[PDB]
Design a protein around this ligand. Structure first.
Ligand SMILES: [Ca+2]
Ligand SMILES: [Ca+2]
Ligand SMILES: [Ca+2]
Ligand SMILES: [Ca+2]
Ligand SMILES: [Mg+2]
Ligand SMILES: [Mg+2]
Ligand SMILES: [Mg+2]
Ligand SMILES: [Mg+2]
Lengths: 233, 233, 233, 233
């Protein structure tokens, strides 16, 4: 199967598969059952911001999520990504809905990776998404262009989110995260999102993920599986 | 045919097709016959540096080439790239040899493009090239990995350059150079090169080019055609 | 006196000193009488954005100003800044009011300068201004901290702008814009502004300027002189 | 006294004050007695490179030093810099010699700091130092301009290093490392150095440091005190 490393923004508590009894952020290593979670005070209809950072010296994957005029939520986990991911990877965003639903809108997205030997770099930034974004790989129900935004999951014309939807968006160019002569390897990611729902129980969430370059959406990965994992193991 | 906009580092004077009677730098717009040239004091076996800049406000393509401890050579040309190139393009480097030969080695390469609306950006930088550079499209005789360098044209094991060779290297991800809401569009490119030859008459040169995303090497474009143009029209 | 190179956002037409009969943007070279102007459709109470660019190869100072959902205004002028400005300079923002008044609020400010020899760089970015901005030199009535913004001219507690006011803000560190070994020198500036006024005739405007490191506000430079020039010569 | 946080490149083992019995790199927190050290295979007359990184989420100060064609040395230490340093600081480089001596030459220096709230940034880069570097504060015997390099300690005309010397170089503009609304604060530093000595026992070393904005060289801080600390407590 695919190799997945992801930071999940989980809006629906599936307590039967390890989720806490509240909206949360988590670090997923090849499993939907997070290795580490933190309580997330999610706000319906508000624009949020997420930061993800990592470097090969400290070997620590940390993430910070916040809303304007509010306190932030953070979570960290010690993991050597060189022992999990291949040398060449692709980065992207994923989201899903099930019987419960929500809008999974992305307003902006930036990413930067550095390889310092004894310096190679890649940086891209989207502040608006065009109708034909040729430097993005869209999978599933993901579409671009609507109000210059990226809609990961299906949304009707009236602006109402649909259930049983799943979509992913990956950057076109592969990313080099390890090299034999490298002394320091690091990356940082930032994206702004807008989750809206007419229901009192939104679902299922958004995730930033890193995977093998030929990764595709697993079958039946709608709902709680966030379009990343084939099962709940 | 392909749409080509290139800055040529011409080492061999082909006076029958418009070249001046000396090594030169030039601006090529859909033709090997440069719209504008400048005298270039090329140095055999020395590492040089080239800078290329452009923005949509001034609509001026300028280039600067220099060696350490020496005076620089520069050339500019007024041209609206929006009236020549498509909305989505690819960028890359090209080189060739004919009956006369030279080494076309690339030591480093950086590129940055900006789209500011009423900001989207792409930046990559190579200071060393690996054996399997997955984020590069290699065409022709171009190879990577040899001493961490990029060899555009064929070079034997003893380090001797071969004749009748041609090779190009393009960045994997397409580049967005125009948008309907953009108020300012700009890009800058920089690469370091090493041209070596045991002969008194090296040939044929190196070029940085911009083209349609599906561009490939034209037939019989070795030698004076720099692997960019099908003929000398 | 001081050496001033500035891009003016002129909101009040002083036709007796060369101004066109409408709000305009202009390039000022050691004089308030602009060398080049362009019509500016200024919008009261709306957030605008200004871009300024220059490089030593083309020797062209260009500026672009725009509002959301509207067409932009642009102006360019050919000038060798090496023949006008000293080797070391300071950059900053200036504004003024006279008998007519307006708010001169700055929401963000970014600047980048590059010196490439045969590479030295400086970059700073403000997206919010703190109460004690130690890396800024405040002159006149300029204050920081109010709603995280930079107020160049005097504004009362109720949010009403005051007349006969003048204020400037300069970056603390000097900027190197020329070097003997430099082959390419360039800079770009961007700032967002908010001009509000209860009157039908706002005044007097905002300007981005470059000057000698020890520049201060000239006496009686309120109103039409934009806090940059001692007289209207 | 001054508040000092520094990463030392210690070339001379002063075992009576806590040094290991070999050249080493260390993390100094308000004391010359390092909180954490690592063995450093220093090479006389070779150009080295040092990387220093930190962020407010992980609260971990890590450093990596390496030479070409050789294995690297690294050291990390958990410390909350918000509980040690003031809100506004200055960054710089320091070096010293005693009865034993060495050249403390700096070839390049880059620094980047980020403040992300619920983004402010500062970045500068020196690849060559001019005779009159107005954006640097030179203290002690530090001079700029010699072969475009920065000589922290005294060197005679013949290129021979002098004993009992001390010099520091700080960036002119203050740096903001903490803010009440900040959710993520980080910085990274990189500099290349050349340590040469005709002796078999070079001394005393080079250090990158962070301090209060009004920091100056302590009396009698030559030799083992690296020009940072008043005593060996
Ligand atoms: Ca869940
Ligand atoms: Ca030719
Ligand atoms: Ca006026
Ligand atoms: Ca010591
Ligand atoms: Mg979960
Ligand atoms: Mg030619
Ligand atoms: Mg005017
Ligand atoms: Mg020590």
């Amino acid at each position: 199967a695919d190799t997945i490393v992801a930071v999940e923004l989980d809006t629906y508590p599936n307590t039967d598969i390890g989720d806490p009894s509240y909206p949360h952020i988590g670090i997923d290593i090849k499993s939907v059952r997070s290795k580490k979670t933190a309580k997330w005070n999610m706000q319906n209809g508000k624009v949020g911001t997420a930061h993800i950072i990592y470097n090969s010296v400290d070997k620590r994957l940390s993430a910070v999520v916040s809303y304007p005029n509010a306190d932030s939520a953070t979570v960290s986990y010690d993991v050597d990504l060189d022992n999990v991911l291949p040398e060449w990877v692709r980065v992207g965003l994923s989201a899903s809905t099930g019987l419960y639903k929500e809008t999974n809108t992305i307003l902006s997205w930036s990413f930067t990776s550095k390889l310092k030997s004894n310096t190679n770099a890649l940086h891209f930034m989207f502040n608006q998404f065009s109708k034909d974004q040729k430097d993005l790989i869209l999978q599933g129900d993901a579409t671009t262009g609507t109000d210059g935004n990226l809609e990961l999951t299906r949304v009707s014309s009236n602006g109402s989110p649909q259930g049983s939807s799943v979509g992913r968006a990956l950057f076109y160019a592969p990313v080099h995260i390890w090299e034999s002569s490298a002394v320091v390897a690091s990356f940082e990611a930032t994206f702004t999102f807008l989750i809206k729902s007419p229901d009192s129980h939104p679902a299922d969430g958004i995730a930033f993920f890193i995977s093998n370059i030929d990764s595709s959406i697993p079958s039946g990965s709608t709902g709680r599986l966030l379009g990343l994992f084939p099962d709940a193991n």
